[PDB]
Design a protein around this ligand. Sequence first.
Ligand SMILES: [Ca+2]
Ligand SMILES: [Ca+2]
Lengths: 230, 230
Amino acid sequence: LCNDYGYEPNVDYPNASHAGLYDRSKQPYVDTAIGPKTTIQFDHVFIKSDFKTWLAHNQDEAILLIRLYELGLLLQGRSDSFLEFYNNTTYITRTDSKQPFLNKYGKLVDTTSVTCLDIFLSVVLFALNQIDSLICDFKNTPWINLSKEHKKIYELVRGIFGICYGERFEYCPFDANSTASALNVNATLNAKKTIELITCGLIRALIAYANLVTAFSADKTALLHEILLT
Amino acid sequence: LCNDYGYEPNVDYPNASHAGLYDRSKQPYVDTAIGPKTTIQFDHVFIKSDFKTWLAHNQDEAILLIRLYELGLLLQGRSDSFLEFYNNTTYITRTDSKQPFLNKYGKLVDTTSVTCLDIFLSVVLFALNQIDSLICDFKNTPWINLSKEHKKIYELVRGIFGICYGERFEYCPFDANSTASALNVNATLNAKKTIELITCGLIRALIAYANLVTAFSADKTALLHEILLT
Ligand SMILES: [Ca+2]
Ligand SMILES: [Ca+2]
């Protein structure tokens, strides 16, 4: 008969299990730290959040999604949020290359309400869908032709995934004059390279989002269960 | 002063608005049809479901996700579910190429419980993550080398997105003997083509999943709100 049937004292008592001899957890006792940074709430009913755990284990990808939130703000005409987005960073020198986004990441981790987090994911998905629609338009004919709206999106999204302006192999050193002919040929190569940089950014962001929103959805099931007793 | 401030009788009374002169809805009155196929429930508290609306507007993509559910079952050792998955189709002739998946689609649309739908999405995400991990392994060196587990996934996922066996341009008609040399060169091209077919299937499935699970998450917020009064 099966020996794993739902009786698991080590799962019921995780802090005591971290004192055992066979615990392999990478950061023991973190799994029981409780505060705004590890919970969400609905109607001030709190749960330990898979969504918050994801943000912590995946800071780099979280910052990718936050940059897409900022894109979403601009495309939705949220002018003040966009223009104040890098405020209150304190430093007059460079620090981390993504400093303003790290700061926003800390504030997202500190957000507990379902209402606020619903807004975050909604804007991110809006941005993801805009990028997908752009790629489909770009690739629907070999001769590149974009809708007016997608021409705008193209440049904004290129500024995130590249080709990043100002950040050598196209010059023809054997006959510099021939570079003029090369530029014509390479203009389409640069646009196609941009779309591949955007496409491979989208896939990374989609895998992150798929997992993050599933964790959030799971958190909401836990809230639905807990609320029935509270 | 703004004239769109939250008073919208045409949104409050949609059936009456469908009798107006400026309704552009593509299938008027469908938005108010209420049954298992358009709702979900938690604790027998029902809401009109964005998740169910998505499945209806996106049947083709829903079937893509259902095929990934079936993959997830096999990889999770759910043997009976996998082997009975095409049962009860009734016909002794061909009909729609995706008949067993259409049938499962109808049963998914008929599923109302959050508990059951959580299971569906969890298995689909499991499959999506397996495919992503495969692609990353495949591409992490130009010389192709896959983990033992990914070699198994590769063949299973190739059977979904291609290259599909048994479903002409590689032969060398000028010197058929040289085809033997071509096969060696083309083996890597066929594996790379397979991964691109898989990669472009993953992106389509991820965009579908991202939108579907966000709609489900939104539905759960509506449940959280409704339950507080019920
Ligand atoms: Ca186009
Ligand atoms: Ca490898």
